[PDB]
Amino acid sequence: HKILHRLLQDSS
Amino acid sequence: KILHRLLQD
Amino acid sequence: SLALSLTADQMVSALLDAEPPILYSEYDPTRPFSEASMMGLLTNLADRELVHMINWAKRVPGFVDLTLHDQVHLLECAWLEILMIGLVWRSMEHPGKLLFAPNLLLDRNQGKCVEGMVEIFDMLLATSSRFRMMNLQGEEFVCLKSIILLNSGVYTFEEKDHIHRVLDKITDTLIHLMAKAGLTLQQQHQRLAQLLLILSHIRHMSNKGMEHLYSMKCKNVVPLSDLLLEMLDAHR
Amino acid sequence: SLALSLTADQMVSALLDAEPPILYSEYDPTRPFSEASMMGLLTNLADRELVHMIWAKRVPGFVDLTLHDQVHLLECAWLEILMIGLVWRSMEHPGKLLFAPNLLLDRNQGKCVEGMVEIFDMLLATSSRFRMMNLQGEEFVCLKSIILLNSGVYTFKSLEEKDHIHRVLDKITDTLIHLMAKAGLTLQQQHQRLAQLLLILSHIRHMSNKGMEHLYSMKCKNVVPLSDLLLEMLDAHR
Ligand SMILES: C[C@]12CC[C@@H](c3ccc(O)cc3)C[C@H]1CC[C@@H]2O
Ligand SMILES: C[C@]12CC[C@@H](c3ccc(O)cc3)C[C@H]1CC[C@@H]2O
């Protein structure tokens, strides 16, 4: 969904 | 300005 | 300055004594609400409250030491924050409702009457719940309201230092109150922070409310008093 | 959680180590600014900073939250976070805003964009305040974490999470106080300084709300192509 969602899950 | 006047009365 | 020589207990007394009365709205129970009539009620109320607020500010220690231009600026900056913290305070003992006036107690569903207002009601109600959870005390409330007056417009400005000395005094007062109430040293700084962080949320609600009020004005929904128009104007 | 088991010194270390990198602007300093040019640089910078801010995951206690709650806090606080970062690094540049090491803008360059100088003045005023208080790096990282956890905490069967966030917030308060005690401040001076710092967060909220409105107006006018990420962040506030 949200780009933010994707960024959070992919955080490094 | 109304506020300016009211701060005196 | 007399304000700086005030003890903590004298500070609290002065602030408690300067508290404005709870005013009634022009609510007419013979008629159903419209977007226009509800906005009229709330804005008529804010207007009468503003007059009392102006006179309350004059009694906040240190305030009258400022130039009229500075007093004007601080109030123009903080007026809606001050109205809102008052509303949240008197709504404390009414879970799910905002006590705008004794004859005007509204839940979020009644907020829906006005386009976009339920969002504001929800934020106010959330803040009210927070006060209730923290068991905010009246002495703490009056300190917080005075901090808002002195702080909100202080950076958009000697006198600056004077305002900060006064603000420091209010901090000392808040700590004094908490110690007197039996809070441990650690609990004191923890509660101080919790209370002050609320002011961030109050600022947020004021900015959102200001945009909404301006929106209603620009759609000719409600006529605002000349004073309210000028207070609103100061934010653009 | 581990967040609550951290010592004050361990909290400061964790926050320091979690600090995002300082990015450069694509700015080419041989070309005068235009309104579009300026907005482009600032928004491009903000978009890249946002990715790095998502730092958030390393803020003690944050990783404990649901994906939903993390999204909410970031959506609420992202511009406040960018702004306090900007104010912090601009501290030692009176009258200027250090957006990047290679993009140092003075007040008048705010006029390059309509309605922006008003924003610049507020940021500059906050910077002067930080400078006046002699704000320390250890205190700054504490304040920025508080913003992340506080700004959207009241916009929330899940009362256990909100209480966890409040426990973490209390720990950060303990940490600020610890730094002040270590710095030799008396009890009265500690409480006074703590109050002073937190009141600045009120002004930072104010600047964010104003900046959000300005960023929105520039968007609608199509005076600048905003990234998909930036548009979604902006959309969350409207
Ligand atoms: C009418 C509005 C609803 C709350 C209202 C208010 C009135 C009196 C108070 O003591 C507090 C708040 C001010 C405006 C702000 C947004 C909205 O337009
Ligand atoms: C481009 C704007 C100016 C500052 C900008 C910003 C960019 C990067 C930062 O690290 C901080 C701030 C955000 C927006 C907010 C208002 C204006 O549109």
Coordinates of C-alpha atoms and ligand atoms in Angstrom, one line a residue:
Chain A
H1 CA 0.0 0.0 0.0
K2 CA 1.6 3.2 1.2
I3 CA 5.2 3.9 0.3
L4 CA 5.8 4.6 4.0
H5 CA 4.6 1.1 4.8
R6 CA 7.1 -0.4 2.4
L7 CA 9.9 1.8 3.7
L8 CA 9.3 0.8 7.3
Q9 CA 9.3 -2.9 6.5
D10 CA 12.5 -2.5 4.5
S11 CA 14.3 -0.2 7.0
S12 CA 18.0 -0.8 7.5
Chain B
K1 CA -7.2 47.8 16.1
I2 CA -9.9 46.7 18.5
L3 CA -7.6 44.5 20.6
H4 CA -5.2 47.4 21.1
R5 CA -8.0 49.6 22.4
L6 CA -9.4 46.9 24.7
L7 CA -6.0 46.3 26.4
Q8 CA -6.2 49.8 27.8
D9 CA -9.8 50.3 28.9
Chain C
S1 CA 9.3 43.6 38.5
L2 CA 6.7 42.5 41.0
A3 CA 6.0 39.3 39.1
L4 CA 9.5 37.9 39.8
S5 CA 9.3 38.6 43.5
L6 CA 6.1 36.5 43.7
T7 CA 6.4 33.3 45.6
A8 CA 5.0 30.1 44.1
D9 CA 1.9 30.2 46.4
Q10 CA 1.3 33.8 45.5
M11 CA 1.6 33.0 41.8
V12 CA -1.1 30.3 42.1
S13 CA -3.4 32.6 44.1
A14 CA -3.1 35.4 41.6
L15 CA -3.8 33.1 38.7
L16 CA -6.7 31.3 40.4
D17 CA -8.2 34.6 41.3
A18 CA -7.9 35.9 37.7
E19 CA -9.8 32.9 36.4
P20 CA -12.6 34.0 34.0
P21 CA -16.2 32.9 34.6
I22 CA -17.9 30.1 32.7
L23 CA -20.2 31.8 30.2
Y24 CA -23.5 30.7 28.7
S25 CA -24.1 30.3 25.0
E26 CA -27.0 31.7 23.1
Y27 CA -28.3 28.1 22.5
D28 CA -31.9 28.1 21.5
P29 CA -33.5 24.7 22.1
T30 CA -36.6 25.5 20.1
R31 CA -34.8 25.1 16.8
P32 CA -32.7 22.3 15.2
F33 CA -29.0 23.0 14.5
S34 CA -27.7 24.0 11.1
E35 CA -24.1 24.4 10.0
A36 CA -24.7 28.1 10.2
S37 CA -26.5 28.3 13.5
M38 CA -23.9 26.0 15.3
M39 CA -21.0 28.1 13.9
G40 CA -22.9 31.2 15.1
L41 CA -23.3 29.8 18.6
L42 CA -19.6 28.8 18.9
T43 CA -18.3 32.0 17.5
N44 CA -20.7 34.2 19.5
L45 CA -19.4 32.3 22.6
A46 CA -15.7 32.8 21.6
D47 CA -16.3 36.5 21.1
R48 CA -17.7 37.0 24.6
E49 CA -15.0 34.8 26.0
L50 CA -12.3 37.0 24.3
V51 CA -13.4 40.1 26.3
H52 CA -12.9 38.2 29.5
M53 CA -9.6 36.7 28.2
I54 CA -8.1 40.2 27.5
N55 CA -8.8 41.2 31.1
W56 CA -7.5 37.9 32.4
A57 CA -4.2 38.4 30.5
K58 CA -3.7 41.8 32.3
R59 CA -3.7 39.9 35.5
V60 CA -1.2 37.3 34.5
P61 CA 2.0 38.4 36.4
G62 CA 4.5 40.1 34.1
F63 CA 2.1 40.6 31.2
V64 CA 1.3 44.3 31.8
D65 CA 5.1 45.0 31.9
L66 CA 5.2 44.5 28.2
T67 CA 4.5 47.2 25.5
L68 CA 1.0 47.3 24.1
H69 CA 2.4 46.0 20.8
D70 CA 3.8 42.9 22.6
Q71 CA 0.6 42.3 24.6
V72 CA -1.3 42.5 21.3
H73 CA 1.0 40.1 19.6
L74 CA 1.0 37.4 22.4
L75 CA -2.8 37.5 22.5
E76 CA -3.2 37.4 18.7
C77 CA -0.9 34.4 18.7
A78 CA -2.4 32.5 21.6
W79 CA -6.1 33.4 21.8
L80 CA -7.5 30.1 20.3
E81 CA -5.0 27.9 22.2
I82 CA -6.3 29.7 25.3
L83 CA -9.9 29.1 24.4
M84 CA -9.2 25.5 23.6
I85 CA -7.3 24.6 26.8
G86 CA -10.2 26.2 28.8
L87 CA -12.7 24.1 26.9
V88 CA -10.7 20.9 27.4
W89 CA -10.4 21.7 31.1
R90 CA -14.1 22.2 31.8
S91 CA -14.9 19.2 29.7
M92 CA -12.7 17.0 31.8
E93 CA -15.6 15.5 33.9
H94 CA -17.7 14.9 30.8
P95 CA -16.3 11.9 28.9
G96 CA -17.2 12.0 25.2
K97 CA -18.5 15.6 25.4
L98 CA -17.2 19.1 25.0
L99 CA -18.7 21.6 27.6
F100 CA -18.6 24.7 25.5
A101 CA -21.1 26.2 27.9
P102 CA -23.3 24.8 30.7
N103 CA -26.2 25.0 28.2
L104 CA -24.1 23.7 25.3
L105 CA -22.6 20.3 25.8
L106 CA -21.8 18.6 22.5
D107 CA -20.6 15.1 21.5
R108 CA -18.7 14.3 18.3
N109 CA -21.9 13.5 16.4
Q110 CA -23.2 17.0 16.9
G111 CA -19.9 18.3 15.6
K112 CA -20.7 16.7 12.2
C113 CA -23.3 19.4 11.7
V114 CA -20.5 21.7 10.6
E115 CA -18.3 20.7 7.6
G116 CA -14.9 19.5 8.8
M117 CA -15.5 20.3 12.5
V118 CA -15.8 16.8 13.8
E119 CA -12.1 16.4 13.2
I120 CA -11.5 19.3 15.6
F121 CA -13.9 18.0 18.1
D122 CA -12.1 14.6 18.0
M123 CA -8.8 16.3 18.8
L124 CA -10.3 18.3 21.7
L125 CA -12.0 15.3 23.1
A126 CA -8.7 13.3 22.9
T127 CA -7.0 16.1 24.9
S128 CA -9.8 16.1 27.4
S129 CA -9.3 12.4 28.0
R130 CA -5.6 13.0 28.5
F131 CA -6.2 15.6 31.2
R132 CA -8.6 13.2 32.8
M133 CA -6.1 10.4 32.7
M134 CA -3.4 12.6 34.2
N135 CA -5.9 13.9 36.7
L136 CA -4.9 17.5 35.8
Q137 CA -5.4 19.8 38.8
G138 CA -6.8 23.4 38.6
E139 CA -3.6 24.9 39.9
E140 CA -1.6 23.1 37.1
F141 CA -4.2 24.2 34.6
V142 CA -3.9 27.9 35.3
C143 CA -0.1 27.6 35.1
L144 CA -0.4 25.9 31.7
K145 CA -2.8 28.5 30.4
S146 CA -0.5 31.3 31.4
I147 CA 2.5 29.6 29.9
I148 CA 0.6 29.4 26.6
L149 CA -0.1 33.2 26.7
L150 CA 3.6 34.1 27.3
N151 CA 5.2 31.4 25.1
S152 CA 3.2 31.0 21.9
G153 CA 4.3 34.3 20.4
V154 CA 7.5 34.8 22.2
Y155 CA 9.9 33.6 19.5
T156 CA 8.1 35.4 16.7
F157 CA 9.3 38.6 18.5
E158 CA 15.3 43.3 27.6
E159 CA 11.6 42.3 27.4
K160 CA 12.3 38.9 25.7
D161 CA 14.4 38.0 28.7
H162 CA 11.7 39.3 31.1
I163 CA 9.1 37.0 29.5
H164 CA 11.5 34.1 29.9
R165 CA 12.2 35.0 33.6
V166 CA 8.5 34.9 34.2
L167 CA 8.1 31.6 32.3
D168 CA 10.9 30.2 34.5
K169 CA 8.9 31.3 37.6
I170 CA 5.9 29.4 36.3
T171 CA 8.0 26.3 36.0
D172 CA 9.2 26.8 39.6
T173 CA 5.5 27.1 40.5
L174 CA 4.5 23.9 38.7
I175 CA 7.3 22.0 40.5
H176 CA 6.3 23.5 43.8
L177 CA 2.7 22.4 43.3
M178 CA 3.8 18.8 42.4
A179 CA 6.1 18.5 45.4
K180 CA 3.4 19.9 47.7
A181 CA 1.1 17.2 46.2
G182 CA 3.6 14.5 47.3
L183 CA 5.1 13.6 43.9
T184 CA 8.7 12.2 44.2
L185 CA 11.6 14.1 42.7
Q186 CA 11.5 11.9 39.6
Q187 CA 7.8 12.0 39.3
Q188 CA 8.1 15.8 39.4
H189 CA 10.2 16.1 36.2
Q190 CA 8.2 13.4 34.5
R191 CA 4.9 15.1 35.1
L192 CA 6.3 18.5 34.2
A193 CA 7.3 17.1 30.8
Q194 CA 3.9 15.3 30.3
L195 CA 2.0 18.6 30.9
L196 CA 4.3 20.7 28.6
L197 CA 4.1 18.2 25.8
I198 CA 0.3 18.7 25.9
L199 CA 0.9 22.3 24.8
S200 CA 2.3 20.9 21.5
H201 CA -1.0 19.2 20.9
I202 CA -2.9 22.4 21.9
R203 CA -0.8 24.4 19.4
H204 CA -1.7 21.8 16.7
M205 CA -5.4 22.1 17.5
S206 CA -5.3 25.8 17.4
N207 CA -3.7 25.9 14.0
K208 CA -6.2 23.4 12.6
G209 CA -9.1 25.4 14.2
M210 CA -7.7 28.6 12.8
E211 CA -7.7 27.1 9.3
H212 CA -11.3 25.8 9.8
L213 CA -12.6 29.1 11.2
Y214 CA -11.0 31.0 8.3
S215 CA -12.6 28.5 5.9
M216 CA -16.1 29.1 7.3
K217 CA -15.5 32.9 7.1
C218 CA -14.4 32.6 3.4
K219 CA -17.6 30.7 2.5
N220 CA -19.8 33.3 4.2
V221 CA -21.2 30.7 6.5
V222 CA -21.1 32.9 9.6
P223 CA -20.5 36.6 10.3
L224 CA -17.6 37.0 12.7
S225 CA -17.5 39.9 15.2
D226 CA -15.0 42.7 14.3
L227 CA -12.7 41.5 17.1
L228 CA -12.8 37.9 16.1
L229 CA -12.1 38.9 12.5
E230 CA -9.0 40.8 13.6
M231 CA -7.8 38.0 15.8
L232 CA -8.3 35.6 12.9
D233 CA -6.6 38.1 10.5
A234 CA -3.5 38.2 12.6
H235 CA -2.8 34.6 11.5
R236 CA -2.5 35.5 7.8
Chain D
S1 CA 11.0 -3.9 26.3
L2 CA 14.7 -3.2 26.0
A3 CA 13.9 0.5 25.7
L4 CA 12.8 0.6 29.4
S5 CA 15.8 -1.3 30.5
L6 CA 18.3 1.2 29.0
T7 CA 20.4 3.3 31.4
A8 CA 20.4 7.1 30.7
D9 CA 23.8 6.9 29.2
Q10 CA 22.8 3.9 27.0
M11 CA 19.8 5.9 25.8
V12 CA 22.0 8.8 24.7
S13 CA 24.5 6.4 23.0
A14 CA 21.6 4.7 21.2
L15 CA 20.2 8.0 20.0
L16 CA 23.6 9.3 19.0
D17 CA 24.4 6.2 17.0
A18 CA 21.0 6.3 15.3
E19 CA 21.5 9.8 13.9
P20 CA 20.9 10.0 10.2
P21 CA 23.6 11.1 7.7
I22 CA 24.0 14.7 6.6
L23 CA 23.0 14.8 2.9
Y24 CA 24.2 17.2 0.3
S25 CA 22.0 19.1 -2.1
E26 CA 22.4 18.8 -5.9
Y27 CA 22.8 22.6 -5.7
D28 CA 25.0 24.1 -8.4
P29 CA 26.3 27.3 -6.9
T30 CA 27.1 28.9 -10.3
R31 CA 23.4 29.4 -11.1
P32 CA 21.1 32.0 -9.7
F33 CA 17.9 30.8 -8.0
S34 CA 14.4 30.8 -9.4
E35 CA 11.2 30.0 -7.4
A36 CA 10.9 26.6 -9.1
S37 CA 14.7 26.0 -8.7
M38 CA 14.5 26.8 -5.0
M39 CA 11.5 24.6 -4.3
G40 CA 13.1 21.8 -6.3
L41 CA 16.2 21.8 -4.2
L42 CA 14.4 21.9 -0.9
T43 CA 11.8 19.3 -1.7
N44 CA 14.4 17.0 -3.4
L45 CA 16.5 17.3 -0.2
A46 CA 13.4 16.7 2.0
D47 CA 12.4 13.6 0.1
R48 CA 15.9 12.0 0.4
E49 CA 16.0 12.9 4.1
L50 CA 12.7 11.2 4.6
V51 CA 14.1 7.8 3.6
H52 CA 16.9 8.1 6.1
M53 CA 14.5 9.4 8.8
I54 CA 12.7 6.1 8.6
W55 CA 16.5 6.5 12.2
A56 CA 12.9 6.0 13.5
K57 CA 13.4 2.3 13.7
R58 CA 16.4 2.8 15.9
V59 CA 14.7 5.0 18.4
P60 CA 14.3 2.8 21.5
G61 CA 10.7 1.7 21.8
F62 CA 9.6 2.5 18.3
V63 CA 10.3 -0.9 16.9
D64 CA 8.0 -2.3 19.5
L65 CA 5.0 -0.6 17.9
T66 CA 2.6 -1.9 15.2
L67 CA 3.3 -1.1 11.6
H68 CA 0.1 0.9 11.7
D69 CA 1.2 3.0 14.7
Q70 CA 4.7 3.6 13.3
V71 CA 3.1 4.9 10.1
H72 CA 0.8 7.2 12.1
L73 CA 3.6 8.7 14.2
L74 CA 5.8 9.3 11.2
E75 CA 3.0 10.8 9.1
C76 CA 2.2 13.2 12.0
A77 CA 5.8 14.2 12.9
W78 CA 7.9 14.0 9.7
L79 CA 8.1 17.7 8.9
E80 CA 8.7 18.6 12.6
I81 CA 11.6 16.2 12.5
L82 CA 13.1 17.6 9.4
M83 CA 12.7 21.1 10.8
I84 CA 14.3 20.5 14.2
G85 CA 17.2 18.8 12.3
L86 CA 17.5 21.9 10.1
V87 CA 17.4 24.3 13.1
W88 CA 19.9 22.2 15.0
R89 CA 22.6 22.2 12.2
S90 CA 21.9 25.9 11.5
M91 CA 22.7 26.8 15.2
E92 CA 26.2 28.1 14.6
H93 CA 25.2 30.0 11.4
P94 CA 23.3 33.1 12.7
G95 CA 20.9 34.5 10.1
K96 CA 21.3 31.4 7.9
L97 CA 19.7 28.0 7.3
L98 CA 22.0 25.1 6.7
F99 CA 19.8 22.9 4.6
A100 CA 23.0 21.0 3.5
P101 CA 26.7 21.6 3.9
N102 CA 26.6 22.9 0.3
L103 CA 23.3 24.8 0.6
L104 CA 23.5 27.6 3.2
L105 CA 20.7 30.0 2.7
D106 CA 20.3 33.4 4.4
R107 CA 16.9 35.0 5.2
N108 CA 16.5 37.0 2.0
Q109 CA 16.8 33.9 -0.2
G110 CA 13.5 32.8 1.4
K111 CA 11.9 35.5 -0.7
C112 CA 12.9 33.5 -3.8
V113 CA 9.7 31.6 -3.1
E114 CA 6.3 33.1 -2.4
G115 CA 5.3 32.9 1.3
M116 CA 8.5 31.1 2.3
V117 CA 10.4 33.9 4.0
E118 CA 7.8 33.7 6.7
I119 CA 8.7 30.1 7.3
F120 CA 12.5 31.0 7.2
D121 CA 12.0 33.6 9.9
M122 CA 10.4 31.1 12.2
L123 CA 13.1 28.5 11.7
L124 CA 15.8 31.2 12.2
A125 CA 14.1 32.4 15.4
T126 CA 14.2 28.8 16.7
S127 CA 17.8 28.5 15.7
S128 CA 18.7 31.6 17.7
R129 CA 16.8 30.2 20.7
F130 CA 18.9 27.0 20.5
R131 CA 22.0 29.1 20.2
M132 CA 21.0 31.2 23.2
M133 CA 20.3 28.2 25.3
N134 CA 23.5 26.6 24.1
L135 CA 21.6 23.4 23.1
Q136 CA 23.8 20.3 23.3
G137 CA 23.8 17.4 20.8
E138 CA 22.8 15.0 23.5
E139 CA 19.8 17.2 24.3
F140 CA 18.9 17.6 20.6
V141 CA 18.6 13.9 19.9
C142 CA 16.4 13.5 23.0
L143 CA 14.1 16.3 21.8
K144 CA 13.8 14.8 18.3
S145 CA 12.9 11.4 19.7
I146 CA 10.2 13.0 21.9
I147 CA 8.7 14.6 18.8
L148 CA 8.5 11.3 17.0
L149 CA 6.7 9.6 19.9
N150 CA 4.6 12.5 21.1
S151 CA 3.2 14.4 18.1
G152 CA 0.7 11.7 17.1
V153 CA 0.3 9.9 20.4
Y154 CA -3.2 11.4 21.1
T155 CA -4.5 10.8 17.6
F156 CA -4.7 7.0 18.3
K157 CA -8.3 -2.5 22.6
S158 CA -4.8 -1.1 22.1
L159 CA -4.3 1.1 25.2
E160 CA -1.3 -1.0 26.2
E161 CA 0.7 0.5 23.3
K162 CA -0.2 4.1 24.1
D163 CA 1.0 3.5 27.7
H164 CA 4.2 1.9 26.5
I165 CA 4.9 5.0 24.4
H166 CA 4.3 7.1 27.5
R167 CA 6.7 5.0 29.5
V168 CA 9.3 5.5 26.8
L169 CA 8.6 9.2 26.8
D170 CA 9.2 9.3 30.5
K171 CA 12.5 7.6 30.0
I172 CA 13.6 10.2 27.6
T173 CA 12.6 12.9 30.1
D174 CA 14.8 11.0 32.7
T175 CA 17.6 11.1 30.1
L176 CA 17.3 14.9 29.5
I177 CA 17.4 15.4 33.3
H178 CA 20.4 13.1 33.6
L179 CA 22.3 15.1 31.1
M180 CA 21.5 18.3 32.9
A181 CA 22.5 16.9 36.3
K182 CA 25.8 15.6 34.7
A183 CA 26.3 19.1 33.4
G184 CA 26.2 20.5 36.9
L185 CA 22.9 22.2 36.8
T186 CA 21.1 22.6 40.2
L187 CA 17.7 21.0 40.6
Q188 CA 15.9 24.3 40.0
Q189 CA 18.0 24.9 36.8
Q190 CA 17.3 21.4 35.6
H191 CA 13.5 21.8 35.8
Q192 CA 13.7 25.3 34.2
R193 CA 15.8 24.1 31.3
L194 CA 13.6 21.0 30.7
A195 CA 10.6 23.3 30.5
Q196 CA 12.4 25.7 28.2
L197 CA 13.3 22.9 25.8
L198 CA 9.8 21.4 25.6
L199 CA 8.2 24.7 25.1
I200 CA 10.3 25.0 21.9
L201 CA 8.5 21.9 20.7
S202 CA 5.3 24.0 20.7
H203 CA 6.9 26.4 18.2
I204 CA 8.2 23.5 16.1
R205 CA 4.7 22.1 15.8
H206 CA 3.6 25.6 14.8
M207 CA 6.3 25.8 12.1
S208 CA 5.4 22.3 10.8
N209 CA 1.7 23.2 10.5
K210 CA 2.6 26.4 8.6
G211 CA 5.1 24.6 6.4
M212 CA 2.6 21.8 5.6
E213 CA 0.2 24.5 4.4
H214 CA 2.9 26.2 2.3
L215 CA 4.1 22.9 0.8
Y216 CA 0.5 22.1 -0.1
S217 CA 0.0 25.5 -1.8
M218 CA 3.1 25.0 -3.9
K219 CA 1.8 21.5 -4.8
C220 CA -1.6 22.6 -6.0
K221 CA 0.0 25.4 -8.1
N222 CA 2.2 22.7 -9.7
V223 CA 5.2 24.9 -9.2
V224 CA 7.2 21.8 -8.4
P225 CA 7.0 18.0 -9.0
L226 CA 6.9 16.4 -5.6
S227 CA 8.0 12.7 -5.1
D228 CA 5.3 10.1 -4.6
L229 CA 6.6 9.6 -1.0
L230 CA 6.3 13.4 -0.3
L231 CA 2.8 13.6 -1.8
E232 CA 1.6 10.7 0.5
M233 CA 3.2 12.3 3.6
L234 CA 1.5 15.6 2.7
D235 CA -1.8 13.8 1.9
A236 CA -1.9 12.4 5.5
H237 CA -2.2 15.9 6.9
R238 CA -5.1 16.9 4.7
Ligands
LIG1 C1 -16.0 27.4 15.7 C2 -14.7 26.6 16.0 C3 -15.0 25.4 17.0 C4 -14.3 25.6 18.4 C5 -14.4 27.1 18.8 C6 -14.3 27.3 20.3 C7 -15.1 28.2 20.8 C8 -15.1 28.5 22.1 C9 -14.2 27.9 22.9 O1 -14.2 28.2 24.3 C10 -13.3 27.0 22.4 C11 -13.4 26.7 21.1 C12 -13.5 27.9 17.9 C13 -13.6 27.6 16.4 C14 -12.2 26.8 16.0 C15 -12.6 25.9 14.8 C16 -14.1 26.0 14.6 O2 -14.4 26.9 13.6
LIG2 C1 10.2 23.6 1.0 C2 9.7 23.9 2.4 C3 10.9 24.7 3.1 C4 11.7 23.8 4.1 C5 11.7 22.4 3.7 C6 12.7 21.5 4.5 C7 13.5 20.7 3.8 C8 14.5 20.0 4.4 C9 14.6 20.1 5.7 O1 15.6 19.3 6.4 C10 13.9 20.9 6.4 C11 12.9 21.6 5.8 C12 10.3 21.8 3.8 C13 9.2 22.7 3.2 C14 8.2 23.3 4.2 C15 7.8 24.6 3.7 C16 8.4 24.8 2.3 O2 7.6 24.4 1.3

